[PDB]
Structure formats: C-alpha cells, structure tokens
Design an enzyme around this catalytic site. Structure first.
Site, PDB file in Angstrom:
ATOM      1  N   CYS A   1       0.814  -1.213   0.000  1.00 40.22           N
ATOM      2  CA  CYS A   1       0.000   0.000   0.000  1.00 40.22           C
ATOM      3  C   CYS A   1       0.851   1.268   0.000  1.00 40.22           C
ATOM      4  O   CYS A   1       0.777   2.079  -0.929  1.00 40.22           O
ATOM      5  CB  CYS A   1      -0.938  -0.023   1.211  1.00 40.22           C
ATOM      6  SG  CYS A   1      -2.251   1.214   1.162  1.00 40.22           S
ATOM      7  N   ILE A   2       1.682   1.443   1.021  1.00 43.52           N
ATOM      8  CA  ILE A   2       2.567   2.596   1.093  1.00 43.52           C
ATOM      9  C   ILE A   2       4.025   2.188   0.925  1.00 43.52           C
ATOM     10  O   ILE A   2       4.864   3.050   0.618  1.00 43.52           O
ATOM     11  CB  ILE A   2       2.364   3.379   2.408  1.00 43.52           C
ATOM     12  CG1 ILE A   2       2.938   4.793   2.303  1.00 43.52           C
ATOM     13  CG2 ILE A   2       2.997   2.657   3.573  1.00 43.52           C
ATOM     14  CD1 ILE A   2       2.087   5.728   1.464  1.00 43.52           C
TER      15      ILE A   2
END
Lengths: 529, 533, 541
Positions: free
Chosen positions: B270-271
């Site tokens: 995700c990040i």
C-alpha cells in the site's frame, strides 16, 4: 405513513427509560438497607428489541425513499440489524441465571412455534389446498409428524396453580364425576342476594378467567359484592369416554344449580358462560324452559358463544372427515388434547406488544408467559361429546333448525332470560357475526357487545388496565356495527351494571369448609406430566 | 428475485452436500477405529431464504407492521436456531464467534468510520469550527472502541505468519526477515518485500495456503521481508525521508550482507510501494548503480489526484490541526486511525471469506482478516505530516517538487521495469489514480488490474481459483482506454507477476539464512497497541 | 544503670504536679460560674500509677544490689506495691461518676488483652510448637482460634466513641456510593487549593478513620488545610452478599471507579494517590493495570504508607503462610462466604506500639488531651469483614505464591508488571513495623519503572505514620541516592526529627499548576463520615 408507528415506539421507548430510571434509584437506595448476614427481566434486553424495531423501520423507510443490487443491500442491512439484536440480547443476559435463561428460551420457542401457521393443521398450507377419502389418510400422517414436532419440543419447570395462577381464595363445596364446584370467599362485608355461577369451556382449562389478581374476572366479580361460583370441568379420562354432551348439560350444569341451592338456599342464580360453556348454559336454559320448570337463571352472559354455526371460520366440517374422527374417537375412547393441540391455535390475538412488552413496562410478570402455559395445558375431550358437537352442532346445526334434542327433549324462543352476548372483533374461532345471528335465537330481552380485540384479549380486559374498548348500541350484523359507538376501557362495568339494573344485599356468604381448597384437584391433572 | 434464489440454492445445496459428506465421515469412522456446528450455518441460510421469500411476497402484494412483525419472527427463529446450534461448541470457540461478529457488525456500519461518516460530510458541506466538530466525532468514535477493548486473537508464529525464516538484521526502524528455502535450487536475484507501515505486514503471510511469502519461496526465490517498527514516542522525529533511506536502502545493504547480491527484486504494497518508488528515484537521481532489478507495486499511490474517500480529510484547516496534534503528541495514534478508515472493505466478506471458508473446511478467513485490520500501528508524527501535506495535499511527487534528504525526486530517471497491480474495487487507492502514476517511470511499464478489493484481489493464491484479472501489453492514452483494450484471464495474477520477474541465468543453490538474531516472525511485528495476554 | 529511667520518671512526675495545680485552679473558677439554678481522669489516678513505677524500680534496684528467702521477699514487697497501687487507684476514683469508671475499666481491660502475646495467634507460643513439625496443625489452629474467639465473645456480650462526633469529624460530603465504597469529598478550609486533587486509598482490613481521628492528628484535615482537594474511599464492610468479591474488584471496581468518580466531581483525570497498608497495594495494582492497558496516565504522584509489594519476608504473619493452613482457610472462606473480622481480631493486632502506654496515654494525658490510646483501641477493635474470594487471593496469590514479584499476577485477565508504571512513587515505611517489615517494602520499591523515593519513619506501624507536625514527636530517615541493599540505604541516609508529612507534601507539590479557587463539594448523598464506616461487627446502641 409511519408517524403513528414512530410515535408509538417513542412512547414505549420513553416508558422503558422511565422504568430504567426507576430501577436505577431503586438499586441505589438498596445500598443503604444492607445487612451483612443475608443473601424480572433486564431492561437492557427489552431495549435491544426496541432498537431492532426502530432501526428496521428506519431502514425500510430509507430504502423506499431511495427508490438486483438494491434488494440485496437492504437484505444485507436487515441481516446486520438481526446480528445486532442477537448480540445485544446475549450480552443483556450477563447476570441472569442459567435456570431463568433456559426458561426464557422455552417461552420464546413456544411463542415462535405458536405464531407459525404451518405448525397448526387448520392453518397448514398443504391441507388447505386439498379443500377425497385419501385426504383423511394424508391428514393423519400430517398430524403424527406435527404431533412429534410438538412432542420433541416438550421433551427437551413453569407456573404452579394455586401459587402463580388460579390463586383466588375459595373452597370446593361439591365434587361430582364431571366437575368440582368452587365457591369463592368474599372480600366485602355485604354481597348481592342472587349468586353468580360461571360455566367455563371444557376445551381448555377454566383458569383463563382466574390468571392473576389484577386480571382475575373472579376476583373482580367478588369485589363487586357478588357470591361467585365456578364450575371446574374434569379432564376427561378413558372412564368418561362414553359421556355425551347432553350429560354436561344435565348432569353437569343442572346439578351445579342444585349444588348452588344446597350451599346458598337460592333457586335462581346469575349465569355467565364462555365459548362452549355458554352454549351448554344456553342449552340448559332452553331445557329448563321447555319443561315449564320455574326459571332458575335470572340473567345470562355469553362470552364468544356460538349458537349458529353457519360461519365456522377456519374446514373440518366436511362429512368424510367428521366420520373418520368419530371412528378414531371410538378407538382411542377420547379426543387427545395433545392431538387436538396441533389442529389449531386458540391464542391468536398483539400478544408480544400488549402482553409481553406492555405488561413488562407495568412491572408485571409477563402475562404472555401465563397465556402460553395455559395454551399448552391442553385437556382431553370425551369421544361421544366430541362427536355430538361435530355432527349435531357444527355439521347439522340442529339448534338453528330446531331439531336439537337434549335427552329426547330445544326452542330458545321459549327462553325468557335476559341475555348479554359479548363477542370479539378479531375472533377466529367464533365469528362475531355468528354470535349476532345466534342472538336472535332467544325469545326474551337481548343485548350485544363487541370487544375491540381478539378471542382472549377483548374478554380478559380488567378496568384498571384501560387497554382496549368496545362497541355498544337490527337487520344485519353489519348494520349494528355502523350504528354502534366506541367506548374506551373495559366492558366489565357494563356487564356488572346489566346484572344490577334489573333489581337487597345480603351479608357476605362465607363458603363452608367443603372438600378441598380453591384450585381443586381436577385442574392440576396434566396430559404431559 | 431469480438470481438471488439461485445463489441461495447454490449455497444450500453445497452446504447440504458438505453436511452429508460429514455424515459419511463419522459413519466410516465407526468401522475404522481401534481401541488404542454446520447447523449454525444452516440457521443463517434459512434466514436469508425466508426473509427473501417474505420480501418478494409483500412487495408483489398496517401492511408495513405485518412485514415488521413477520421479519421480527424470522429474527427470533434465527436467534433460537443459532443458539441451539452452539450447544456442544466449546466456550472458547463460542467467545471467538461472539468477538469477531461484533467486529464485523461495527465494521460494516458506515457511521462507525470517520471517512465514510455522513455527519462529518454535513460539516464538510464551515471553517475553524469544522475542526471542533471533527474532534467531537473522533473522540466519540474513539470512546466506543475502548468499550470493545478479548483473548480471541491468533498468536503470530502459531496461527498466522508462520513461514519459517530468521531475523538476520535489526535496526531502529525494522527487522529484516530472511525466509528459509523449501527448494533445492533458487534464483540468483533475491526478493525484497516492502510492506506498508500503516498496518502490519503479515497480510502477505497469513496461512500457508494463502501466504504470498510461502508461495514466493516455493517458486525458488530467496524472499526478504521488512518488518517495520510500531513507532513510539521515541521515534517522533522520524520522517518519510528516513523510511526511504534508513529503511529501504539500509535493507538493501542488509541483503548484500546476507547474500552478497547488490541487486534484488522489489515488491511493495500500500505505502511500501510508494516508499520503494521513492527509494529507486533517490538512487537514480544520485546516479548510483541500479540496485533494484524489477519492481512490483500493489495498490501503490504516486499520483494523489484521486484520493477516494480519504479526500474528505484533504483540506488545509483539517491538515493543519493534525500537524499540530502530531507534533505535540509525537505520533499519530493507530487507535485514532482505526476509527478513521478501514483498509478492509471487501464487498463480499461475509459470503466469500466466512461462508465459503466453512464450505472449504478452512478456519474462517474473515476472522484472520478482521484480526489483521484491528492490529493497528502508530505513525511517526513528522512522517504523518509529510505524508499528509507533501503527498496528499501538495502532491510534490507528481510536480517533481518532492525532496528526500535535500535530493529532488524525479521518477522519470528510474529505468527499472515496473509492474503495477491494482484492484478494481479498491477504496484506498483508486486504480485510475495508480494508472496515472505509472506513466511517471522512465523504463519498462506493465499494468495489471485485479478483480476484487484492496485485500482480496491481492491475496489470491493460485490454488483458490477464485477471481481473475485484466492484462494489456500495449500502451494507452487513458485508464478507460487501457481497460477496453485489456483481456480478462481467470485465476490468480501471481503467476503473471513471477513471469515478469523471471523473464528478465542459471539458478544457484538455496541460500540458507544464518542463525541471525531472532526466530521467523521476529519481535517487532508482535507489538500491539492494545496488548493481549 | 537506671539513670534514664529515673530521669524520665522525675520529668513525668514534675509535669503531673504542674497539671495538678492547674486542675486545682480549674475547679476553683468553676465555683464562680454557678447559676444557682442548674471527662478528664483525676491526676491522683495517674499519680497512683507513677508511684508504682518508681517504687517498683527502686525496690528492684535495691534487691539487685543486695544480691529461697531472697526471691520470696522481693515477691512479697512487690505484692505490697500492687496492693498500694490498687488502693490508690480506687481512691482516686472517689467522686468520679460510674460512667467514667466503666469507660476506664473497659479500655484498661482492652489494653491488657492487647499486650498479651498469648491472646493472638500470630504471636502465640503454643501455636508455634505445632509449626515446628499437616492436618494436626490445621485442627490445632482451629481449636486455638475457636478458644480465643470464645474468650473474646464472652467479654463482648457484657458491654463509646460516635463517628462524626468524637472521631472522623472532618467536614465533607459523600459524592458517590457504590457496592464497594462511599467516596467522601472533604469541604475546604482554604481560599485556594491545588489543581490536582488528592485521593486516599485506605486498607480494607480495618476502617479508614485511622487517618482521620481527631483534628490534632487528622491526616485528612492537615491535607485539607495545606490547600489540597481531598477525596477518601470508604470501603463497605463486606457482608455475606459480597462473598464473591475478589481483589480484582477492589482494584478495578473500587479504585478505578473512584478515579472516575473524582473526575465526575472535579473534571480532573489525574489525581495524587495516597495508600495505606493494603490500599497502597491496591493503588499499586491500579497503576500497573492502567499502564498494562496503555490508558492515559491518571495518577500524577503516588505515596504509599507501609505498602507490601514483595511478600518474601511477611514478618510475624509468616507463620500462617503454609499450604495446609491456606488450603484449610480457603475451605472456610468458601463455606462461610466471608472472613469474619472477629476471627481476624485474634489472629494478629495491627496496633502494637511499644510506647503506647507512655507516649499515647500518659503523655497524651499530660497534654490536656483525651487519651489518644483510647481512640486507637476503639479503632483496632472496630474490625471489618473480608470477602471470601478476596482473602483467598491475598493468602495464595500474594503472600504464598508472591505473583507480583514473579510477574505472574493477573487482574481480570491482565498480567501486571509494575515496571511499566512511570508514576513517581514515594514509599514511607516504619522502622518498628511488625506488619510490613520496611526491608520488604524497600525490596518492592525496585519494581517500579519510574521515579522512586523512600522514607523510613522512626516508630511502629501506626505511631510513625500518624505523626502530625504539631506534635514534633519522632523523626525519619531520608536518602536521595539509589542503593543496592536496605542496609546500604540506611547507612547512607540522614536523620531528621519531627514529622515527615511536609516531605510528602513537598514531594507532591514539586512535581507540578496555578492554584484554583477552593472546590466546594456538591450536596452529594450523605454527610461527611458516611454510612459504610458506621457498620460495626459487634453492634452498639
């Protein structure tokens, strides 16, 4: 079009918060009165259910306003509300004992099954479609499976009579083969001269009229200054298999009148009858009048009494079915109340709202639990009595056609006793129109009253509750209703006034020691021990 | 109507077929023995079918009250049937069902999350007062969670994240997990996984059947996993630059120390994908020799033009208030973030990951996913501010204004072949946005669109044969144009990703990790915000 | 070698002679205050006792220098001193009303029984014989306990201070009442008070008013006068209904609930904590519980008086710490439901000061005070019950197993580690303490993970703690540095005379908060003392 519903829920929600506030101060005040040598349902559970009602109603209004996927999303959100109800219900039962918890699951399972139309034969869908001789065999197979379903529920503990129900003080002053006669002790200094005799139905037990002191018709009649007698029908056994309906009229009702005279010295009494006890009382009055005996019933009150069976509501009246049951009745000897219990449900009123939620909000032990105990306290039926009621009354309707004979003897036009008929608008067993048509059968003064509820709630409505109403005032049953006025509250004062209007009080009659205390031995006999 | 009843019949027959098979299993057990709650699922199925029949009946036909009364009876029947099914179930499993059900119910309530709260939308629809209204909503949502705050959790290393490995390096920001091989020979270039530091990494290593790490190991690849620290008050001054340089680059040096390889295959979530992208840009902007041979980015946001439902927070007064709170308090509390948004919002969680898991004889996957989602982690104060302002608000990476330790970042200098894998139903990173950011790279580019949400579409092992994906080798002018030209293929996209890595040399013998410092899962991952005993 | 003894006697004799002069003038002025139309024990009684002490010491010294017939002669002369003492005591009560005679006879009999070691199980010599080598000990303990209980019972049936009038009369309000406690908030006597309020956690073994006895030695009144909002937990006297209450409930439903109740009354989420014998232990467990669950810090400072966290050396209570006795005791608590405080009264005595007669009866009388020893004796005999499940936890989980030191203790499925607590603590123990040996309290201080301070009072379990500055009676030892052993700490500590109460107040005040206007307590539910404390095991009408 949800305003009244949101208002009714807000009213109930506000009453529950007030009861929670009352419990909060009660338990807080209890802390002061503690000794260090000693030692109802949670309001949170009721709040959980109320939350389900409003949220589901809010969800429905929300989905209708928004108007494949739309149906599913509402289903998903409704399932989420179901999950919240289950979780909140389980958590609310934290401190409740397992014994009380088991009792709660029992009454809920009992109530759910009672409200299921398939679980009762008369409202089971398969046989409704059938409406030849093959059907009879199929009907027996349906009953055996339905009987097993009820039996498995019963196999997998409640209210005791004389302590929790039917606890009005009295004495058994006469016991015969068919009944115990209960005479109730007074609560006033003086009572009316003419005593009162109640003829309950022999389909279920009599204590529907004597449940709890607040809603006890007997206790209310006693407080009105009236000597009250109650017939307590025997639970028919194999020995009473050959007893007929006529015997209930002559050896049951007429003998009780002589017993009332033996206990009070009065040859004339005020008569009060229910669904089939009133019918037996009606047949007794016609029998006494046809033989030109001096009148022994001054007034007659008939609750949900069927004299004309032209409108039978909810199906068995077809001749082949009646014959098949009559043969089975001869084989078994009696009509088993456990077998009869799966045929139809006597209790189909608002039971949840007025007898579970509302009774709980009034600090009462839930009345619906008492009704479900009564409904499952089934009684047998005599074989010959059952057949007579099936053929001569439901099928042939001999009383309307004037062909009915009671021991080779009936014309209600000869009856000059003033009658008061009390019927129910939502009645499913005795259609009120039929009671109105049957009111015309009498030859004397006639009055009619229609209660604003079902078979039970409209009758068992004590004035203190002020829960329902009734219509008072013809060419048709419909014509009377349009010209009738609604009157709130209970109709019991109207019935009591009708008795008192016709006419000196006497000192309160203390019943003799008799044979037994108030509840008696006949009623305690259960089919499922 | 028709399709719903058909789907219901499908589950009813599959449950009846599985129930009959279990009946045969116990019957055969009687013969083959030496001396020495499927009814609950049926209870729920009956509710769905009975409520659907009543709904169809009433819609085709005071009337409102009757539907409510009949609907209430179905709820009562459901409660009785559900409780009775739990008679013989042990108390431990019964509590686990009560716990996860409450989690699922609260998770499905849109009001229970700030990002999807309608009340907060009403305020968004005000100036400095907006912050105060937001604060009262946040404190109210935070308070409710404490009442929920219970040892129904799975222990890491025992039920989840049990892939064998060793912790070969521990720094202030991460433990580097090197997984022991299960093959005789492995690929030359090792694999480095950069998970997000918003939640914990074991979403990619859940259970052996759906463990991405275990699957990569079985394909003959040395797998490394960064295990981020759950940041405390001591790490208040850690910045996004530190995660890029002291986190990812340092991990690359750790891989060299453990394997002797200066180039690895990169995988980001995700990040972490954003951090991996910034790490490659940092190395390329400073002209260091390429150390990332291939890069795979799952639901990675480089262009924040489409922030999804998180865009409600992207307003200067709200961001300024959070910058003050993060600086004063030191960290962004994960307990506050847990009520802000939900990383796990699959549209078919009950049906595909609870019901189906029962029919597949598996421990319900929805329970594991809800445990992971509620395993919140803190965020460094300065790191959160940088992520809020420099990326979501200012969008410095697209405009080329982003600097990582006084180093301007331009992703156009990156010549590493990238493969972006996004989810069509993603709520955090809209795939269109991820496609717009893919064009920022200067080397080979490939794009893949998974046929599910943020989590289900990514964690789809080949064995399941549950979903599909869209692929398109040609270039396109728009996301909509790419999808129109893309071909759909059923199954998992994991084999396609392995080909992207593998197509780019004879394999070498399996690298056995040194004894290292700690066992497989490590200790950094076990730190919970709400401890469990 | 009798110099100090004769010196102390001459001092007391001269002070008594001066007080006799004061009483002689006292009655003379009363005669002036006669209206035509319409207490303190006589100094002669105290003089009678002083005469016995000096004569017996002189006789003992005379016979020892002179040192069958010698043994008998001293016995005979000692008997004469006893007879002269009896005659003088009775004669001193000449005009005294019968009530005062009864009150004096009652407290004397109470005092005599308290000083008898045989009358207590913990210090009984016969019970000690059984300890030095199963069911034999269990039954032997039961017959002794029942016999001691029988002896006390016949004494009680033949039968002073009213709470709120003579003791525990500090003005305040009951602002919250729960199943376990009444929360007393005391009304202020200052114009301004500190922002952070003070919450006192007394032990649930006896009643709380040991810390609020009389205005001169009332800790609560002193804390109030120093500008501090004072809250007091008043535990319920546990009944049969509370048989299932456990130590966890006192920690969570008692102390934590009180913190929320203090916040409800003031709006403050952080208070200054003060705990006594076992309340300090409960207060310690509350801080560990809040830290183990990472709740926002709610205790700014913690002061613990005679608090036991390490039970390795239980002092004279160690005789009971044995599995057969504990197993037998757990059976009784489960069956009876509660641990009867009347049974606990014969097990051990919380009040065992050596100088009780001299410093709190003789000395207190010479200060024109109503004898403080009478108040202490009422407190000690105002026993309270203990919940059955709570007592078992204290016996097994703390005294026997010592789970808190080993980290095995759990409070509602929450493992407790005091190392996670970062609240600055101040431990104040007593050098002559018999219930919680100060060495043990020092060993338990190292369990905390934050700031630590230690103070050693110069007296016993009660006298060293209830030492108001006005009295200027004793001293204490302080040492700021950290030490490796209790003896190393004591060797490095400096002695300071007077009371240690200002040190605790300085400890509390230094950690801070501009003062706020004095908090007037709400009308609440009840007046100051409350209703929970008045419940006595032996009722009085």
């Amino acid at each position: 079009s949800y305003g009244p519903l949101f208002e009714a829920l807000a009213h109930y929600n506000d009453k529950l918060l007030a009861m929670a506030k009352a419990q909060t101060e009660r338990t807080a005040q209890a802390l002061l009165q503690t000794n260090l040598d000693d030692l109802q349902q949670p309001w949170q559970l009721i709040q959980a259910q109320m939350n389900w009602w409003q949220d589901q109603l809010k969800l429905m209004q929300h989905t209708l306003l928004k108007s494949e996927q739309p149906i599913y999303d509402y289903l998903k959100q409704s399932y989420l509300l179901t999950a919240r109800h289950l979780l909140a219900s389980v958590d609310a039962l934290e401190g409740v004992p397992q014994k009380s918890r088991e009792r709660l699951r029992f009454f809920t399972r009992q109530y759910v099954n009672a409200m299921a139309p398939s679980n009762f034969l008369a409202t089971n869908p398969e046989l409704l479609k059938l409406t030849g001789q093959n059907l009879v065999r199929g009907l027996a197979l349906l009953a055996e499976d339905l009987e097993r379903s009820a039996d498995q529920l019963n196999i997998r503990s409640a209210f005791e009579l004389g302590r929790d129900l039917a606890l009005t003080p009295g004495r058994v002053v006469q016991r015969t083969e068919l009944y115990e006669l209960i005479q109730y002790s007074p609560t006033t200094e003086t009572v009316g001269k003419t005593p009162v005799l109640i003829v309950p139905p022999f389909i279920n037990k009599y204590y529907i009229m004597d449940m709890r002191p607040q809603n006890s018709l007997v206790a209310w009649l006693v407080a009105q200054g009236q000597t009250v007698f109650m017939i307590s029908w025997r639970n028919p056994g194999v020995a009473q298999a050959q007893i007929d309906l006529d015997d209930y009229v002559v050896d049951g009702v007429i003998a009780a009148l002589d017993g009332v005279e033996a206990a009070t010295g009065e040859r004339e009494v005020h008569g009060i009858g229910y669904c089939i006890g009133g019918t037996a009382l009606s047949l007794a009055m016609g029998w006494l009048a046809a033989r030109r005996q001096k009148q022994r019933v001054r007034t007659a009150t008939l609750f949900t009494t069927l004299l004309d069976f032209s409108q039978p509501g909810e199906i068995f009246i077809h001749e082949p079915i009646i014959a098949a049951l009559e043969a089975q009745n001869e084989a078994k000897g009696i009509m088993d109340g456990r077998q009869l219990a799966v045929s139809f449900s006597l209790l189909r009123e608002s039971l949840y709202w007025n007898y579970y939620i509302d009774s709980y909000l009034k600090g009462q032990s839930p009345v619906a639990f008492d009704l479900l105990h009564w409904n499952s306290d089934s009684t047998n039926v005599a074989g010959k009595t059952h057949n007579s009621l099936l053929r001569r009354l439901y099928l042939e309707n001999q009383l309307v056609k004037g062909e009915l004979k009671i021991r080779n003897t009936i014309d209600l036009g000869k009856v000059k006793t003033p009658v008061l008929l009390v019927s129910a608008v939502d009645d499913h067993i005795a259609l009120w129109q039929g009671t109105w048509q049957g009111m015309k059968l009498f030859g004397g003064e006639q009055r009619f009253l229609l209660a604003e509820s079902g078979h039970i709630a409209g009758i068992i409505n004590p004035p203190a509750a002020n829960k329902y109403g009734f219509w008072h005032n013809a060419e048709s049953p419909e014509s009377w209703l349009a010209g009738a006025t609604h009157q709130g509250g209970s109709w019991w004062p109207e019935m009591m006034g009708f008795i008192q209007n016709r006419d000196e009080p006497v000192p309160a009659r203390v019943p003799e020691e008799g044979l037994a205390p108030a509840p008696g031995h006949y009623v305690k006999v259960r089919l499922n021990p």
